[PDB]
């Protein structure tokens, strides 16, 4: 009972860096914390929300965060609310 049982290595991103990042968390709350130290950011004092690069919807529950496969892309908006919103004409 040392390693985690249901662990899913997902990929996160930063609002200032356009490159993709990678983290390892089983629950959203864990993805952020682990995504804060791995992301190596200094604006950690900002509440970074989570959204979907495909649907762009925020998931306040690990539901979708776990319903997805191991390889998944996510985005977190730092103090800069500049988020990517898609509008279907």
């Amino acid at each position: 009972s040392g390693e985690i049982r249901t662990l899913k290595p997902c990929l996160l991103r930063r609002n200032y860096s356009r490159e993709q990042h990678g983290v390892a968390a089983s629950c959203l709350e864990d993805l952020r914390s682990k995504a804060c130290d791995i992301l190596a950011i200094d604006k950690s004092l900002t509440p970074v929300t989570l959204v979907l690069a495909e649907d762009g919807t925020i998931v306040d529950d690990d539901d979708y965060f776990l319903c997805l496969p191991s390889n998944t892309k996510f985005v977190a908006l730092a103090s800069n609310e500049k988020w990517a919103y898609n509008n279907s004409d």
Binding site: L52, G56, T57, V59, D60, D61, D63, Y64, L66
Partner: protein, 81 residues
Amino acid sequence: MLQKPKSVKLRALRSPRKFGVAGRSCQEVLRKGCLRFQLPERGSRLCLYEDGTELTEDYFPSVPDNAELVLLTLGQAWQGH
């Protein structure tokens, strides 16, 4: 957590926001996002997007695949046709 979550993205009207959560428990999925929007029953009514006519937190309107419910709290019902 569970081992069979359903894909059900949520939506809102007052503020332009959409909470996507795939929970296996119907009433649960809504009780969460719905409560996040801070909307009472009589004061605020939850409905679907396309029809938006009526939506009971009990179960979904024969729409298990996805449940795009848009929170609605006004004297009129939602009618996105």
